[PDB]
Design an enzyme around this catalytic site. Structure first.
Site, PDB file in Angstrom:
ATOM      1  N   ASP A  35       0.824  -1.205   0.000  1.00 57.57           N
ATOM      2  CA  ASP A  35       0.000   0.000   0.000  1.00 57.57           C
ATOM      3  C   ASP A  35       0.861   1.259   0.000  1.00 57.57           C
ATOM      4  O   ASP A  35       1.364   1.671   1.040  1.00 57.57           O
ATOM      5  CB  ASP A  35      -0.899  -0.018   1.245  1.00 57.57           C
ATOM      6  CG  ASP A  35      -1.799   1.188   1.334  1.00 57.57           C
ATOM      7  OD1 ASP A  35      -1.919   1.913   0.333  1.00 57.57           O
ATOM      8  OD2 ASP A  35      -2.396   1.396   2.417  1.00 57.57           O
ATOM      9  N   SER A 199      -0.865  15.515 -12.062  1.00 55.24           N
ATOM     10  CA  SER A 199      -1.130  15.153 -13.439  1.00 55.24           C
ATOM     11  C   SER A 199      -1.389  16.415 -14.260  1.00 55.24           C
ATOM     12  O   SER A 199      -1.927  17.400 -13.755  1.00 55.24           O
ATOM     13  CB  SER A 199      -2.331  14.206 -13.500  1.00 55.24           C
ATOM     14  OG  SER A 199      -2.740  13.943 -14.831  1.00 55.24           O
TER      15      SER A 199
END
Length: 330
Positions: A35, A199
């Site tokens: 994770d 992004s």
């Protein structure tokens, strides 16, 4: 040194991925959920409340000759999906894919929430976010990667998750045969303890690319892709009959649909998520309403590039002095 381990979807939907991890001496192999959005290595154990264990493999520290109780240390964690666990702490030898760390903090669960009990395939978590998020008290502990880093050939790990198929976590090297083209690197902020990046935009299907900054985290422990409501609405508008359902808890769509792809930007590069990666199947057994793999982050407080996004790429988690993230197509 290096390590390399195969990671395997837990079910036919790729709801999560498990990777075998050797703990203790002799080794006890547990299947952990790696994770990159958390920083605790915790396991089901011989200390876990018996009624809260249902099929998981447990770590028994009393059977490990290298286990040592970390005196006074406790831990307690709550995850974004509402699940939680807590317990005490041992140090022991931990190996992943041939890479060994001695003295790793292994957090032994005394209690786990129902979601963990109900998932027989996940024996615990191995956190790969920054050690500043580790919950051990009163002395915070380091992640497996943080402990291994100095010994690695290069201070990196990579995630290569499969779509409906196994994939690979590598430590200490970049497998140049595992991706196509080049790896595009992008800046990371560690201020919130995550692999947080921005992004450069998105496209839906064959549509034009929208240049827009989307801050979010690369999180292998989250199944879906969680993005701003504007972006998510633009995606689902291209699927006839798709709608946001408050009763179900997100966007659903007719199972008869053909889903469009979703592209996200990494600098000037582009990662394409095929439409089929966005299908999470019937909302309940036998239903013709299917659950979407792109959902709104509104009210999460952060955008999350979870497995839906990451499995479309070869992803480099670069733990150099100034960390960065790399993405390649594959």
């Amino acid at each position: 040194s290096t390590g390399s381990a195969t990671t395997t979807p837990i079910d036919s939907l790729d709801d999560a991925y498990i990777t075998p991890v050797q703990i203790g001496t002799p080794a006890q192999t547990l299947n952990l959920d790696f994770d990159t959005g958390s920083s605790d290595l915790w396991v089901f154990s011989s200390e876990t409340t018996a009624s809260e264990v249902d099929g998981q493999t447990i770590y028994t520290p009393s059977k490990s000759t290298t286990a040592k109780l970390l005196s006074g240390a406790t831990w307690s964690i709550s995850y974004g999906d509402g699940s939680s666990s807590s317990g005490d702490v041992y140090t022991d030898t931990v190996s992943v894919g041939g890479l060994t760390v001695t003295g790793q903090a292994v957090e032994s669960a005394k209690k786990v929430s129902s979601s963990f009990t109900e998932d027989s395939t996940i024996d615990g978590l191995l956190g790969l976010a920054f050690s500043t998020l580790n919950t051990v008290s009163p002395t915070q502990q380091k992640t497996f990667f943080d402990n291994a880093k100095a010994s690695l050939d290069s201070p990196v790990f990579t995630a290569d998750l499969g779509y409906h198929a196994p994939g690979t976590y590598n430590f200490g090297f970049i497998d140049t045969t595992a991706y196509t083209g080049s790896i595009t690197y992008t800046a990371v902020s560690t201020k919130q303890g995550f692999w947080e990046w921005t992004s450069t935009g998105y496209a839906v299907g064959s549509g034009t690319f929208k240049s827009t900054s989307i801050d979010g985290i690369a999180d292998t422990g989250t199944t879906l892709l969680y993005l701003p409501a504007t972006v998510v609405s633009a995606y689902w508008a291209q699927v006839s009959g798709a709608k946001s359902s408050s009763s179900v808890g997100g966007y659903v769509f007719p199972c008869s649909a053909t889903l469009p792809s979703f592209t996200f930007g990494v600098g000037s590069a582009r990662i394409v998520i095929p439409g089929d990666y966005i299908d999470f199947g019937p909302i309940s057994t036998g239903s013709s309403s299917c659950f979407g793999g792109i959902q709104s982050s509104a009210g999460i407080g952060i955008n999350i590039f979870g497995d839906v996004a990451l499995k479309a790429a070869f992803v480099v988690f670069n733990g150099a002095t100034t960390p960065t993230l790399g993405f390649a197509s594959k």
